[PDB]
Coordinates of C-alpha atoms in Angstrom, one line a residue:
Chain Y
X1 CA 0.2 0.1 -0.1
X2 CA 1.2 3.4 -0.7
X3 CA -0.3 6.7 -0.9
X4 CA 0.3 9.0 -5.0
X5 CA 2.8 12.0 -4.0
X6 CA 2.7 15.5 -6.5
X7 CA 4.1 16.5 -9.1
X8 CA 3.9 20.4 -10.0
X9 CA 5.6 23.1 -13.0
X10 CA 4.8 26.6 -13.5
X11 CA 6.1 29.2 -16.3
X12 CA 4.6 32.3 -16.2
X13 CA 4.6 34.8 -20.3
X14 CA 4.1 37.9 -20.1
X15 CA 1.3 39.5 -23.2
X16 CA 4.0 41.3 -24.7
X17 CA 6.1 37.6 -25.4
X18 CA 2.5 36.2 -26.4
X19 CA 1.6 39.0 -28.6
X20 CA 4.7 38.3 -30.6
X21 CA 4.9 34.7 -30.7
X22 CA 2.2 34.7 -32.4
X23 CA 4.1 37.3 -34.7
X24 CA 6.9 35.2 -35.3
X25 CA 5.3 31.9 -36.3
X26 CA 4.2 30.1 -33.3
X27 CA 0.9 29.6 -31.4
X28 CA 1.4 30.7 -28.0
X29 CA -1.9 29.3 -25.9
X30 CA -1.2 26.7 -27.8
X31 CA 2.8 26.4 -27.8
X32 CA 2.8 26.6 -23.8
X33 CA 0.7 24.3 -22.7
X34 CA 2.7 21.8 -24.9
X35 CA 6.1 23.1 -23.0
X36 CA 4.6 21.9 -19.7
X37 CA 3.5 18.4 -21.0
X38 CA 7.3 18.0 -23.0
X39 CA 9.0 19.2 -19.5
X40 CA 6.4 16.9 -16.8
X41 CA 7.6 14.4 -19.2
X42 CA 10.7 14.9 -19.5
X43 CA 10.5 14.2 -15.9
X44 CA 8.6 11.7 -15.5
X45 CA 11.2 9.6 -16.8
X46 CA 13.9 10.5 -14.9
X47 CA 11.9 9.5 -12.0
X48 CA 11.1 6.4 -13.6
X49 CA 14.6 4.9 -14.9
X50 CA 15.9 6.5 -11.4
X51 CA 13.5 4.5 -9.5
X52 CA 15.2 1.6 -11.5
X53 CA 17.8 2.0 -10.3
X54 CA 17.5 2.3 -6.6
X55 CA 15.2 -0.2 -7.2
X56 CA 16.9 -3.3 -9.0
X57 CA 18.9 -6.2 -6.7
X58 CA 22.7 -5.6 -8.2
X59 CA 23.6 -8.8 -9.7
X60 CA 27.5 -9.9 -8.8
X61 CA 29.1 -13.1 -9.3
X62 CA 32.2 -14.1 -7.8
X63 CA 34.6 -14.4 -10.6
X64 CA 34.2 -11.3 -12.7
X65 CA 31.3 -9.5 -12.1
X66 CA 32.3 -8.9 -8.3
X67 CA 32.7 -5.0 -6.5
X68 CA 29.4 -4.9 -8.4
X69 CA 29.4 -4.0 -11.7
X70 CA 31.7 -5.0 -14.7
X71 CA 34.7 -3.6 -16.2
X72 CA 35.1 -3.7 -19.9
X73 CA 37.8 -3.0 -22.2
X74 CA 38.4 -1.9 -26.1
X75 CA 41.2 -4.3 -26.8
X76 CA 40.6 -7.8 -28.4
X77 CA 37.7 -7.9 -30.7
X78 CA 33.9 -8.1 -29.8
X79 CA 35.2 -10.6 -26.7
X80 CA 34.1 -7.7 -24.8
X81 CA 31.4 -6.9 -26.5
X82 CA 30.0 -10.8 -25.6
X83 CA 31.5 -10.6 -22.0
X84 CA 28.7 -7.7 -21.6
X85 CA 25.7 -9.6 -24.3
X86 CA 26.9 -13.0 -21.6
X87 CA 25.8 -10.8 -18.7
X88 CA 22.9 -9.8 -20.0
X89 CA 21.3 -13.4 -20.8
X90 CA 22.1 -14.7 -17.0
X91 CA 20.6 -11.6 -15.4
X92 CA 17.3 -12.7 -17.6
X93 CA 17.5 -16.4 -16.0
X94 CA 17.6 -15.3 -12.7
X95 CA 14.9 -13.0 -12.9
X96 CA 13.0 -16.6 -14.1
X97 CA 14.9 -18.5 -11.5
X98 CA 13.5 -16.1 -8.3
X99 CA 10.8 -14.0 -9.8
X100 CA 9.3 -16.4 -11.9
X101 CA 8.8 -13.8 -15.2
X102 CA 10.3 -13.3 -18.6
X103 CA 11.7 -10.2 -18.6
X104 CA 10.3 -8.7 -21.2
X105 CA 12.2 -5.7 -21.4
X106 CA 15.7 -4.3 -21.1
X107 CA 17.6 -0.7 -20.0
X108 CA 20.3 0.4 -20.2
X109 CA 23.4 3.7 -21.1
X110 CA 23.6 4.8 -24.2
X111 CA 27.1 4.1 -23.7
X112 CA 26.7 1.1 -22.3
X113 CA 24.3 0.2 -25.0
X114 CA 26.6 0.4 -27.9
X115 CA 28.7 -2.5 -26.4
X116 CA 25.9 -4.9 -26.4
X117 CA 25.4 -3.8 -30.1
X118 CA 28.4 -3.9 -30.4
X119 CA 28.5 -7.8 -29.5
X120 CA 26.8 -8.3 -33.0
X121 CA 22.8 -10.4 -32.5
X122 CA 21.6 -6.6 -32.4
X123 CA 18.7 -6.7 -36.0
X124 CA 17.0 -2.9 -35.9
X125 CA 13.6 -4.2 -36.4
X126 CA 12.0 -7.4 -34.8
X127 CA 12.4 -10.3 -37.0
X128 CA 8.2 -10.9 -35.7
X129 CA 6.2 -8.1 -36.1
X130 CA 5.0 -7.5 -32.0
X131 CA 4.8 -4.4 -30.4
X132 CA 8.1 -2.9 -31.7
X133 CA 6.5 0.2 -30.4
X134 CA 10.0 2.4 -31.6
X135 CA 12.0 3.9 -28.9
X136 CA 14.2 0.9 -28.7
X137 CA 17.9 1.0 -29.5
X138 CA 17.4 -2.8 -31.0
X139 CA 15.5 -5.7 -30.0
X140 CA 18.7 -8.0 -29.2
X141 CA 18.9 -12.4 -30.4
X142 CA 16.7 -12.8 -27.1
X143 CA 13.6 -10.9 -28.5
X144 CA 14.2 -8.5 -25.8
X145 CA 13.8 -5.3 -26.6
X146 CA 16.9 -2.7 -25.7
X147 CA 16.3 1.1 -24.7
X148 CA 17.9 3.6 -24.8
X149 CA 18.5 5.9 -21.3
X150 CA 20.9 9.3 -22.3
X151 CA 19.6 10.2 -18.3
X152 CA 20.9 8.4 -15.4
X153 CA 24.9 9.3 -14.8
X154 CA 25.6 5.2 -14.0
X155 CA 26.7 3.5 -17.7
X156 CA 24.6 0.3 -16.2
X157 CA 22.3 -1.6 -17.7
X158 CA 19.1 -2.5 -16.1
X159 CA 16.7 -6.3 -17.0
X160 CA 13.1 -5.9 -15.7
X161 CA 9.7 -7.5 -16.2
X162 CA 6.1 -6.3 -17.3
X163 CA 3.3 -8.4 -17.7
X164 CA -0.1 -7.7 -17.7
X165 CA -2.1 -11.2 -18.8
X166 CA -5.5 -9.2 -18.5
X167 CA -8.5 -8.5 -16.2
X168 CA -6.6 -7.0 -13.7
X169 CA -3.7 -8.7 -13.1
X170 CA -0.8 -6.6 -14.0
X171 CA 2.6 -6.9 -13.1
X172 CA 5.8 -5.1 -13.7
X173 CA 8.8 -4.1 -11.9
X174 CA 7.8 -0.2 -11.3
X175 CA 4.2 0.1 -11.8
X176 CA 3.7 4.2 -11.5
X177 CA -0.2 4.2 -11.7
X178 CA -1.2 7.8 -12.4
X179 CA -4.1 9.4 -10.2
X180 CA -6.3 11.6 -12.0
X181 CA -10.1 10.3 -11.5
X182 CA -12.9 11.8 -10.3
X183 CA -11.1 14.9 -12.2
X184 CA -13.1 16.8 -15.2
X185 CA -10.7 15.2 -18.3
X186 CA -10.0 16.1 -21.7
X187 CA -8.6 13.3 -23.6
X188 CA -8.0 11.0 -20.3
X189 CA -4.7 10.5 -21.1
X190 CA -3.8 13.6 -20.2
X191 CA -3.0 12.7 -16.3
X192 CA -3.7 16.4 -14.5
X193 CA -5.2 19.5 -15.5
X194 CA -4.4 23.0 -16.4
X195 CA -4.8 25.9 -14.5
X196 CA -4.6 29.9 -15.2
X197 CA -3.8 32.6 -12.8
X198 CA -3.4 36.2 -14.2
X199 CA -1.8 37.7 -11.1
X200 CA -2.8 41.4 -9.6
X201 CA -0.1 43.2 -9.2
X202 CA 0.8 42.7 -13.1
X203 CA -1.5 41.1 -15.2
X204 CA 0.8 38.6 -17.4
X205 CA -0.9 35.6 -16.8
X206 CA 0.8 32.0 -15.6
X207 CA 0.3 28.6 -16.0
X208 CA 0.1 26.1 -13.8
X209 CA 0.3 22.0 -14.2
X210 CA -0.9 18.8 -11.3
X211 CA 0.3 15.2 -12.0
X212 CA -0.3 12.6 -9.2
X213 CA 1.1 9.0 -9.5
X214 CA 1.9 6.3 -7.3
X215 CA 5.6 5.0 -8.2
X216 CA 4.4 1.8 -5.8
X217 CA 7.7 -1.1 -6.6
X218 CA 6.0 -4.5 -7.5
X219 CA 5.5 -6.8 -4.6
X220 CA 7.7 -10.2 -3.3
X221 CA 9.8 -7.2 -2.3
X222 CA 10.1 -6.7 1.5
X223 CA 12.8 -5.0 3.0
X224 CA 15.6 -6.0 4.6
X225 CA 15.2 -6.4 8.5
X226 CA 11.4 -6.0 7.9
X227 CA 11.0 -9.5 6.7
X228 CA 7.9 -11.2 7.4
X229 CA 5.5 -8.4 7.7
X230 CA 2.5 -8.3 5.8
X231 CA 1.8 -4.0 5.2
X232 CA 5.1 -3.6 3.4
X233 CA 4.3 0.2 2.3
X234 CA 6.0 -0.5 -1.3
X235 CA 6.6 3.2 -1.6
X236 CA 9.3 4.4 0.0
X237 CA 12.6 3.5 -2.3
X238 CA 14.5 3.2 1.3
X239 CA 13.5 0.5 2.3
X240 CA 12.9 -1.0 -1.2
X241 CA 16.9 0.0 -2.0
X242 CA 18.3 -3.4 -3.4
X243 CA 16.2 -5.8 -2.1
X244 CA 13.6 -5.9 -5.1
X245 CA 13.1 -9.1 -7.2
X246 CA 11.3 -8.8 -10.3
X247 CA 15.1 -6.1 -11.5
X248 CA 18.3 -6.5 -11.7
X249 CA 21.1 -3.7 -11.9
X250 CA 24.8 -3.5 -13.3
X251 CA 26.8 -0.8 -14.2
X252 CA 29.3 -1.3 -16.5
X253 CA 33.1 0.8 -16.2
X254 CA 34.7 2.4 -18.6
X255 CA 37.3 4.4 -19.3
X256 CA 36.1 8.1 -19.5
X257 CA 36.0 10.1 -22.7
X258 CA 37.6 13.1 -23.6
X259 CA 36.6 16.1 -23.8
Chain N
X1 CA 20.8 23.6 -19.2
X2 CA 18.4 21.0 -21.0
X3 CA 16.2 19.2 -19.9
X4 CA 17.6 15.8 -21.6
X5 CA 21.2 17.1 -21.1
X6 CA 21.1 17.1 -16.9
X7 CA 18.4 14.3 -15.4
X8 CA 18.6 16.1 -12.2
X9 CA 14.4 17.0 -11.5
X10 CA 13.6 20.2 -10.3
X11 CA 10.2 19.9 -9.7
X12 CA 9.3 17.5 -7.0
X13 CA 10.3 16.6 -3.2
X14 CA 14.2 17.9 -4.7
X15 CA 12.5 21.8 -5.7
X16 CA 14.5 24.3 -7.1
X17 CA 14.5 27.3 -3.8
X18 CA 15.4 23.9 -2.3
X19 CA 18.2 23.1 -3.6
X20 CA 19.9 26.6 -2.0
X21 CA 20.0 25.0 1.5
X22 CA 21.2 21.6 -0.3
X23 CA 24.6 20.6 0.6
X24 CA 27.0 21.0 -1.5
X25 CA 29.4 17.8 -2.6
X26 CA 33.3 18.7 -1.7
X27 CA 36.5 16.4 -1.6
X28 CA 36.2 17.5 1.8
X29 CA 32.8 17.2 2.8
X30 CA 32.4 13.8 1.4
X31 CA 33.5 12.4 5.2
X32 CA 30.3 13.7 6.6
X33 CA 27.5 11.9 4.9
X34 CA 25.2 10.0 7.8
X35 CA 21.7 8.5 6.8
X36 CA 19.0 11.1 5.6
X37 CA 20.5 13.9 4.7
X38 CA 20.3 14.9 0.9
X39 CA 23.2 16.3 -0.7
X40 CA 23.7 17.3 -4.8
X41 CA 25.9 17.3 -7.1
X42 CA 25.9 19.0 -11.0
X43 CA 22.4 20.0 -9.9
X44 CA 21.3 16.1 -9.1
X45 CA 20.6 15.6 -5.5
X46 CA 20.8 12.3 -3.5
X47 CA 20.6 11.1 -0.1
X48 CA 22.1 8.7 1.7
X49 CA 21.7 5.7 2.3
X50 CA 24.2 3.7 4.6
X51 CA 26.4 5.8 7.4
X52 CA 29.2 7.6 6.3
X53 CA 29.5 6.8 2.1
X54 CA 32.6 7.1 0.5
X55 CA 34.3 5.4 2.9
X56 CA 35.3 1.6 1.7
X57 CA 34.9 3.0 -1.9
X58 CA 38.8 4.3 -2.2
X59 CA 38.7 6.1 -5.7
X60 CA 39.9 8.8 -6.1
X61 CA 38.8 10.7 -8.7
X62 CA 34.8 12.5 -7.1
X63 CA 32.4 12.2 -9.4
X64 CA 33.6 8.2 -10.5
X65 CA 33.5 7.5 -6.7
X66 CA 29.8 8.8 -6.2
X67 CA 28.9 6.6 -9.2
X68 CA 30.3 3.8 -7.5
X69 CA 28.2 4.5 -4.3
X70 CA 25.2 4.9 -7.3
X71 CA 25.7 0.7 -7.5
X72 CA 26.7 0.0 -4.2
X73 CA 23.0 0.8 -2.5
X74 CA 25.2 3.6 -0.1
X75 CA 23.9 6.0 -1.5
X76 CA 20.2 6.5 -3.6
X77 CA 19.1 9.4 -6.4
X78 CA 16.5 11.9 -4.8
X79 CA 14.9 12.6 -8.4
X80 CA 11.4 11.4 -6.1
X81 CA 8.2 12.8 -6.3
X82 CA 6.7 15.8 -3.8
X83 CA 4.0 14.4 -1.2
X84 CA 0.9 16.5 -1.2
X85 CA 1.2 19.0 1.3
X86 CA 4.1 20.9 -0.3
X87 CA 1.8 22.0 -3.2
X88 CA -0.4 23.4 0.0
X89 CA 0.5 26.0 2.8
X90 CA 0.3 28.5 0.7
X91 CA 4.1 29.0 1.0
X92 CA 5.2 27.2 -1.7
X93 CA 8.1 27.9 -4.0
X94 CA 7.3 25.7 -7.2
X95 CA 9.3 24.5 -10.1
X96 CA 9.5 27.1 -13.0
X97 CA 9.7 26.0 -16.8
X98 CA 11.6 28.2 -19.0
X99 CA 13.4 28.5 -22.8
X100 CA 14.5 30.3 -24.9
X101 CA 14.3 30.2 -28.7
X102 CA 17.8 31.5 -30.5
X103 CA 18.4 32.0 -34.1
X104 CA 20.7 30.5 -36.9
Chain J
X1 CA 27.9 47.8 -62.4
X2 CA 24.8 47.5 -59.5
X3 CA 25.8 44.2 -57.8
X4 CA 23.8 42.1 -55.3
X5 CA 25.7 44.5 -52.7
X6 CA 23.7 47.5 -53.5
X7 CA 20.6 46.2 -53.5
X8 CA 19.0 45.1 -49.1
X9 CA 17.4 41.9 -47.8
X10 CA 14.8 42.0 -46.1
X11 CA 13.5 39.3 -44.3
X12 CA 15.1 35.8 -43.9
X13 CA 12.8 33.1 -44.8
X14 CA 11.5 30.5 -41.9
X15 CA 13.2 26.9 -43.0
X16 CA 12.9 24.7 -39.8
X17 CA 12.1 25.0 -36.9
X18 CA 14.3 22.7 -34.0
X19 CA 13.0 21.3 -31.0
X20 CA 14.6 18.7 -28.9
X21 CA 12.8 15.7 -27.0
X22 CA 14.3 13.1 -25.3
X23 CA 12.8 9.4 -26.8
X24 CA 10.4 9.9 -23.3
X25 CA 10.1 5.8 -22.7
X26 CA 8.3 4.9 -20.1
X27 CA 5.4 3.9 -21.5
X28 CA 6.5 0.4 -22.3
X29 CA 9.5 -0.2 -19.5
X30 CA 7.0 0.1 -16.9
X31 CA 3.0 -1.1 -15.9
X32 CA 0.4 1.2 -15.7
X33 CA -2.6 1.0 -14.6
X34 CA -5.0 3.8 -12.8
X35 CA -6.0 4.5 -9.9
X36 CA -9.3 5.9 -8.7
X37 CA -7.9 6.6 -5.4
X38 CA -5.6 8.9 -3.1
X39 CA -3.7 5.4 -2.0
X40 CA -2.8 2.4 -4.1
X41 CA -2.9 -1.4 -3.2
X42 CA -1.2 -3.9 -4.7
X43 CA -2.0 -7.0 -3.6
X44 CA 0.4 -10.4 -3.0
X45 CA -0.7 -13.7 -3.2
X46 CA 1.8 -16.7 -3.2
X47 CA 1.7 -19.9 -2.6
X48 CA 3.5 -21.7 0.1
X49 CA 4.9 -25.5 1.1
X50 CA 4.2 -27.1 4.3
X51 CA 7.8 -25.2 5.0
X52 CA 6.5 -21.9 4.8
Chain E
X1 CA 14.6 -31.3 -26.5
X2 CA 16.7 -29.7 -24.4
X3 CA 16.7 -28.7 -20.9
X4 CA 19.2 -26.9 -18.6
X5 CA 19.3 -24.6 -15.0
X6 CA 18.4 -20.9 -15.7
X7 CA 21.8 -19.9 -14.8
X8 CA 23.4 -22.5 -17.7
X9 CA 20.5 -21.9 -20.1
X10 CA 22.2 -18.1 -20.1
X11 CA 25.4 -18.7 -20.7
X12 CA 24.1 -21.3 -23.8
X13 CA 22.3 -18.4 -24.7
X14 CA 24.9 -16.1 -24.9
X15 CA 26.8 -18.2 -27.1
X16 CA 24.5 -16.5 -29.6
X17 CA 22.6 -18.7 -31.9
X18 CA 19.7 -18.0 -29.6
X19 CA 17.1 -16.4 -31.6
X20 CA 13.7 -16.2 -29.9
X21 CA 11.2 -16.9 -32.8
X22 CA 12.2 -20.6 -34.4
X23 CA 12.2 -19.9 -37.5
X24 CA 9.6 -21.8 -38.9
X25 CA 6.0 -21.5 -37.1
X26 CA 6.6 -24.9 -36.1
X27 CA 4.5 -26.1 -32.7
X28 CA 7.0 -23.8 -30.3
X29 CA 3.8 -23.1 -28.1
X30 CA 5.4 -21.2 -26.2
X31 CA 6.9 -22.0 -22.1
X32 CA 10.8 -22.2 -23.8
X33 CA 13.5 -20.1 -22.9
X34 CA 15.0 -20.4 -26.8
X35 CA 14.6 -22.2 -29.8
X36 CA 18.6 -22.8 -31.1
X37 CA 19.9 -23.0 -33.6
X38 CA 20.4 -27.1 -34.3
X39 CA 16.7 -27.3 -33.8
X40 CA 16.4 -27.4 -30.1
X41 CA 13.9 -26.0 -28.0
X42 CA 15.6 -24.8 -24.8
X43 CA 13.0 -24.7 -21.2
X44 CA 14.2 -23.6 -18.7
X45 CA 14.6 -25.5 -14.9
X46 CA 14.6 -23.2 -12.1
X47 CA 14.6 -25.6 -9.5
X48 CA 16.9 -28.5 -9.6
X49 CA 20.3 -27.4 -7.8
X50 CA 22.2 -28.5 -10.0
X51 CA 23.5 -26.3 -13.6
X52 CA 23.4 -28.9 -15.8
Chain R
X1 CA 33.9 17.0 -42.1
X2 CA 35.1 20.0 -41.0
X3 CA 31.8 20.0 -38.7
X4 CA 31.5 17.1 -37.7
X5 CA 33.0 17.3 -33.6
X6 CA 35.8 15.1 -32.4
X7 CA 34.8 11.8 -30.6
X8 CA 37.8 10.6 -29.0
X9 CA 37.8 7.6 -25.4
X10 CA 41.3 7.7 -23.5
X11 CA 42.2 3.8 -24.0
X12 CA 42.4 3.5 -27.6
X13 CA 40.4 6.1 -29.6
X14 CA 43.2 9.1 -28.1
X15 CA 44.7 11.4 -30.8
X16 CA 41.9 11.8 -32.8
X17 CA 41.1 8.4 -34.2
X18 CA 42.7 5.0 -34.0
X19 CA 44.6 1.8 -35.8
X20 CA 44.1 -1.1 -37.0
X21 CA 45.5 -3.8 -38.1
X22 CA 45.8 -6.6 -40.3
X23 CA 46.3 -9.6 -38.5
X24 CA 44.6 -11.5 -36.5
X25 CA 41.3 -12.5 -37.0
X26 CA 37.8 -9.9 -37.5
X27 CA 39.4 -8.9 -34.7
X28 CA 40.0 -5.5 -36.0
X29 CA 37.6 -4.7 -38.1
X30 CA 34.7 -5.4 -35.7
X31 CA 36.6 -3.4 -33.5
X32 CA 35.7 -0.3 -36.0
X33 CA 32.3 -1.5 -36.2
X34 CA 32.1 -0.6 -32.1
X35 CA 33.5 2.8 -33.2
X36 CA 30.2 2.7 -35.4
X37 CA 27.6 1.8 -33.0
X38 CA 29.7 3.8 -29.6
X39 CA 29.3 7.4 -31.9
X40 CA 25.5 6.7 -33.2
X41 CA 24.6 6.5 -29.4
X42 CA 27.1 8.9 -28.7
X43 CA 24.8 11.2 -30.5
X44 CA 21.7 10.0 -28.8
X45 CA 23.4 11.2 -25.7
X46 CA 23.2 14.6 -26.5
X47 CA 21.5 15.7 -29.6
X48 CA 18.6 13.5 -28.8
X49 CA 17.8 12.2 -32.7
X50 CA 18.8 9.3 -34.0
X51 CA 21.1 9.8 -36.4
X52 CA 19.8 7.8 -39.7
Chain O
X1 CA 33.8 7.3 -41.2
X2 CA 31.6 9.6 -39.8
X3 CA 28.0 9.6 -38.3
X4 CA 25.5 12.0 -38.6
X5 CA 21.8 12.9 -38.5
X6 CA 19.0 13.3 -40.6
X7 CA 15.3 13.9 -39.5
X8 CA 12.7 15.6 -41.4
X9 CA 9.3 14.1 -38.9
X10 CA 7.1 17.2 -40.8
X11 CA 5.3 20.3 -42.3
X12 CA 8.7 22.4 -41.3
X13 CA 10.7 20.6 -38.8
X14 CA 13.5 19.6 -40.5
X15 CA 16.7 18.6 -38.6
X16 CA 20.1 17.3 -39.6
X17 CA 23.5 17.7 -39.9
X18 CA 24.5 20.0 -42.6
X19 CA 21.2 21.6 -44.0
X20 CA 22.7 22.5 -47.6
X21 CA 19.3 24.5 -48.4
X22 CA 19.4 25.0 -52.5
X23 CA 17.7 29.3 -53.4
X24 CA 16.4 29.0 -56.2
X25 CA 12.9 30.1 -55.8
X26 CA 11.0 33.1 -58.0
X27 CA 13.8 32.6 -60.6
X28 CA 12.0 30.5 -64.0
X29 CA 13.1 27.1 -64.3
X30 CA 12.2 24.4 -66.3
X31 CA 10.7 22.1 -63.7
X32 CA 12.2 23.0 -59.8
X33 CA 15.2 19.4 -60.3
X34 CA 16.7 22.3 -61.8
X35 CA 18.4 24.2 -58.9
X36 CA 20.2 26.5 -61.4
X37 CA 19.6 28.5 -65.2
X38 CA 22.7 28.1 -68.7
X39 CA 23.8 31.0 -70.8
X40 CA 24.7 31.6 -73.9
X41 CA 26.7 34.4 -75.1
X42 CA 29.4 33.6 -78.0
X43 CA 32.2 36.5 -77.2
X44 CA 32.3 38.8 -80.8
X45 CA 35.9 38.5 -81.5
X46 CA 35.6 35.1 -82.5
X47 CA 32.1 33.4 -83.0
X48 CA 32.1 30.0 -80.7
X49 CA 29.7 30.3 -78.4
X50 CA 30.5 29.7 -74.4
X51 CA 28.1 27.9 -72.2
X52 CA 28.0 29.1 -67.8
Chain P
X1 CA 49.7 23.8 -37.5
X2 CA 52.2 20.7 -38.0
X3 CA 54.1 21.6 -34.6
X4 CA 52.3 19.7 -31.9
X5 CA 52.1 16.9 -35.2
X6 CA 55.7 15.5 -34.6
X7 CA 54.2 12.8 -38.3
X8 CA 57.5 13.3 -40.5
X9 CA 55.9 12.3 -43.7
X10 CA 54.1 15.5 -45.2
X11 CA 50.5 13.7 -46.0
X12 CA 49.8 12.2 -43.0
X13 CA 50.9 14.9 -40.7
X14 CA 48.3 17.2 -43.3
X15 CA 46.1 14.5 -42.3
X16 CA 46.6 14.1 -38.9
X17 CA 45.6 18.2 -39.0
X18 CA 42.8 17.5 -40.3
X19 CA 41.4 14.7 -37.3
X20 CA 43.1 18.1 -35.1
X21 CA 40.8 21.1 -36.5
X22 CA 44.1 22.8 -37.1
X23 CA 44.0 22.7 -40.9
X24 CA 40.1 23.1 -42.9
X25 CA 39.4 21.6 -45.5
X26 CA 38.8 24.7 -48.0
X27 CA 36.0 23.7 -50.5
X28 CA 33.9 26.2 -50.1
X29 CA 31.3 28.2 -52.9
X30 CA 32.0 31.8 -52.7
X31 CA 31.0 34.7 -51.6
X32 CA 28.3 35.8 -54.3
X33 CA 31.1 39.0 -54.9
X34 CA 32.7 37.1 -56.1
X35 CA 31.3 36.6 -59.7
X36 CA 30.0 40.5 -60.6
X37 CA 33.4 42.9 -60.3
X38 CA 33.1 42.3 -64.0
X39 CA 37.0 40.7 -63.6
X40 CA 36.2 37.1 -62.4
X41 CA 38.0 34.0 -63.8
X42 CA 34.9 31.0 -63.5
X43 CA 36.8 28.0 -63.2
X44 CA 36.7 25.8 -66.5
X45 CA 35.0 22.3 -66.9
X46 CA 37.0 20.9 -70.2
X47 CA 36.4 17.5 -71.5
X48 CA 37.9 14.8 -73.6
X49 CA 36.8 11.2 -75.6
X50 CA 40.0 8.6 -76.8
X51 CA 38.6 5.8 -78.3
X52 CA 39.6 1.9 -77.4

């Protein structure tokens, strides 16, 4: 059980700027309401992507992946490239070993994904016309779509599972679950309404935007030192940090890129 | 800065005005943090999970050593959603959205 | 010899806009279901051996 | 058919030649880690303590 | 050529560009291919476009 | 080896390295794809035509 | 340029510079004012035919 939280944004513009915006090509009332939606969505990904980082259990092995993450080197063939692909596949089975699920997605940093792609076996479009839905780097030989991050400052690799069997049984790491029902909305995909004020001192209007969502970890992820408990709040990341099953993170150690 | 470039979140529990009071990470301030208390670096704000981080991590570089802690569960990114009471107290610094157009 | 230097240009044509939006990937990475109450509860039901 | 434990069946997939959907629209019947290039479907164990 | 930003890593691709050798298998040609994949990824991290 | 990007989402939003963008609007041209007009002069000292 | 470039061969040293942004390829369209002064040496196009 987790209570939702709130995200709010406000920009504000002057009528003078809006007046010349129309004379300069754009549609200020329509363009401005687009900017917040892009901003809010761009922040939500920074929440969801960086929530998997603070939830997914680290996958370590004694031989190489000890000390937290695997280090790769450019030398000697795709040998380094295919080594990561091996660590990707083992993470899939480890999910199926404990979370019994199929691990139908994979997320990694932009630089981290290229070496995963450099191993071959990364055909751009899938052989089967599945969901694809763009927004993916490749699709891997394992059939797992690969998603590029470009945001998280980690150089990591994350494998997780998203499944909706049907009816009410929807299961997957990080549940999101926005909260807007009961509120008068147009096009219910909006997730939150706008608001205009126009302050009295000046008269330039401002626009606000409110969004609420749950963003809780999946079950079977009880916090350590709690173990036996049946009211576990799956929202507080501090308790779920590392104590998850349906997602396994793996960083990558690479030489720094000169600037 | 460009939204996609940073990765930090300003609308939420972090806020923007709140970032002023958040302690800046230094080479000296590393050996002071505890459980709870936040810390920011390159406008990205994290909270510390396990007491006295950057102690088992002997990496000399500051930026890399911070990245080590992320994997080792020692610290955690504080990109998070604000609690409902934050925007209804009549004293609420709400995050701002800004834009700029340059012509080539 | 009236060249183009004599002439004066006017409005520079607006050839193309350019916005920068990240490939926001969250409709696929996580599973979403709208909640009709401020607090959302997910039931974790498990099957156990006679040793729990 | 070919059956292997979860960790063992991963390095088997790590060798390439483990395209998810089979080349031919054969029985498949899901419930398979992969289908291999040799034509042997691979089934995940996740129960036995052997890694075989 | 004169506009594109150089992409140099520390270990191998220092001094602006990478040297290769005919010896020892595609272990050289595939090294270039990895750099192509890195360059594509490096574009999306900073320019967010798809690099087609 | 150079990697860039070309994207034309539609309408007026067009983004890509090196925009080229030839300038021929207004000129009397045969098919919009010619991009540039020809000319013939025939100098007076000789009588040989020249094309530019 | 060619100061930090220690390569002895002139051609390679020049090729070194292009990747280090010291020199720049000068393939570039002329300014409009060049072909108007009534004294403009426009480049020529030449063709030859040999039979086998």
